[PDB]
Amino acid sequence: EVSQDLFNQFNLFAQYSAAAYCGKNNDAPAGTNITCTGNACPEVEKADATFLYSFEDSGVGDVTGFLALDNTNKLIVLSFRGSRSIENWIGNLNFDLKEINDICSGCRGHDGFTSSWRSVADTLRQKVEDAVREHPDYRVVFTGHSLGGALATVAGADLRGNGYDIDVFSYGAPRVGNRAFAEFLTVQTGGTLYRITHTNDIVPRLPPREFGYSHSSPEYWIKSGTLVPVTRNDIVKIEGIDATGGNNQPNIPDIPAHLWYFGLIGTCL
Amino acid sequence: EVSQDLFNQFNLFAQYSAAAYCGKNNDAPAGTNITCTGNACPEVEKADATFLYSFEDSGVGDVTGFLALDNTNKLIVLSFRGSRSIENWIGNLNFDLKEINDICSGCRGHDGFTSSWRSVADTLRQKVEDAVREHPDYRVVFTGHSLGGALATVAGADLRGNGYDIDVFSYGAPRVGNRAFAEFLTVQTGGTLYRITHTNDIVPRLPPREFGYSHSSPEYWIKSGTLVPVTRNDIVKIEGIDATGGNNQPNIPDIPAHLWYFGLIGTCL
Ligand SMILES: *[C@@H]1O[C@H](CO)[C@@H](O)[C@H](O)[C@H]1NC(C)=O
Ligand SMILES: *[C@@H]1O[C@H](CO)[C@@H](O)[C@H](O)[C@H]1NC(C)=O
Ligand SMILES: CCCCCCCCCCCC(=O)O
Ligand SMILES: O=Cc1ccc([N+](=O)[O-])cc1
């Protein structure tokens, strides 16, 4: 069980994460209203929310996403898109670690996530910094679904502690690195990570523990079914690095559960 | 705005209509349980419901669907799939009428749906007749989404009057013929047709009335949004051939609205 305000926040950033796929966007001028097809992001459309900067297939990892300004909620939101086809992305997912002492000593992260981020970090940091300067009062939020969720988690860990808090809301994110990287994520000040999972979603169960991955704590776990609407009672806060009894349970996982966080996500009607 | 009992039927056959796309049965032998992927048909799975005959790309229209036995609800269900890529099917959709006197006098129907039905009619009639014999007190229901709705409607008009009632539940069905056919489907005895539409779904708006097409009355119009759950209070019975102020409004239409009838339909998570 979670509060009404936190629920609202979860719902909202699920929608900012969905909008990265379903935005009628990119090649889209900054200052343009954010809108989505197929009722993917109505809470974003109600807000006075506009693109600050769009990126598409940027750097080494072909990164895609947007930076947004939201005058109603007082946010600067960096939203990273997951893969265009999650099924093949999961299939070709490689489990190699690389060191990232730059982020925390002793830390190793998934190699493709950290290198995709690393390769666009300098541009996007500057874009965020610019927006922070313009709106010092506004709250900085990074978010994403799936691989997008990963990238937002990495960028957060990397960019925190430079003066402004960075909250992270992740939906169906994979593990992003080794224990230690997990531990850092569980305690790092300068922002909070809300790591949201749904039922038996496959993606947060990869990379597997066996390959040297852990999940940060806590975990926000939606227990309502696929295509079922979520209420506050359906969300369970689960404490403990690599805790079991939320998404991390011993049963057959599901791709469709990956695509239903509050609403349709990771696909566009 | 509709009865609970009617809302429950509408929901059940939306799910049988969704199963024609989802829940693997590709060669599933007769008598196996009906199930779907992606929580597309839970009310069906909850019933004691089994396949009688599966068909696929059958006849000239590459018609696909199944016939089921439902012992819990006491039904014999013939469910037609719509198109495997609806956006395309929408783009390739010819508006030509053809005479269909055999069904009714002065009646013209859409050439492709009519022909497609006619090519499978004998084999499917025989399979329904068999089940009707083994279960004389079960209700015969034909149902379908999109193209599947057109077909079910045509098949119903074509096989009624043989001694067993056939009810038809269509979802997001296009127009199937001319005003004289609309009339025949409005008043025909030996069953009821329940023609359900959602919001500004585009498909029930095609073929255009400006190509000689008309809609049978009544229409059951779902006013709740895309990705929004439906209650009995969100459905409005609209009376009159080519009535306006349900789905048939001059506003701009939408494809995602076509894929949300009670739940997700015409696509599988
Ligand atoms: C963008 O949204 C703003 C505030 O929410 C609204 O006043 C404006 O009409 C919208 N702009 C366009 C171009 O639709
Ligand atoms: C088929 O469903 C029936 C009841 O609806 C159930 O008794 C039976 O076990 C199911 N068969 C399988 C293989 O699950
Ligand atoms: C009654 C079942 C009819 C379903 C089969 C139609 C074939 C769908 C293939 C996709 C081509 C198209 O876009 O129309
Ligand atoms: O509607 C609510 C609401 C609550 C909190 C937040 N937020 O902190 O961004 C946004 C929306």
Curated annotation (Swiss-Prot), chains A, B:
Reactions accelerated catalytically: a triacylglycerol + H2O = a diacylglycerol + a fatty acid + H(+)
Catalytic site positions: S146, D201, H258
Summary of temperature dependence: Active over a broad temperature range.
Keywords: Cleavage on pair of basic residues, Disulfide bond, Hydrolase, Lipid degradation, Lipid metabolism, Signal, Zymogen
Entry EC number(s): 3.1.1.3
Xref: CDD domains: Lipase_3
Biotechnology: Used as a detergent lipase. Sold under the name Lipolase by Novozymes. Engineered variants are sold under the names Lipolase Ultra and LipoPrime.
pH dependence (UniProt free text): Active at alkaline pHs (up to pH 12 approximately).
Molecular functions (GO terms): triacylglycerol lipase activity
Disulfide bonds: C22-C268, C36-C41, C104-C107
Top-level taxonomic group: Eukaryota
A Gene Ontology BP annotation from the UniProt entry: lipid catabolic process
Enzyme class at the top of the EC tree: hydrolase
Family the UniProt entry places it in: Belongs to the AB hydrolase superfamily. Lipase family.
The name this protein goes by in its record: Lipase
Organism, as annotated: Thermomyces lanuginosus (Humicola lanuginosa)
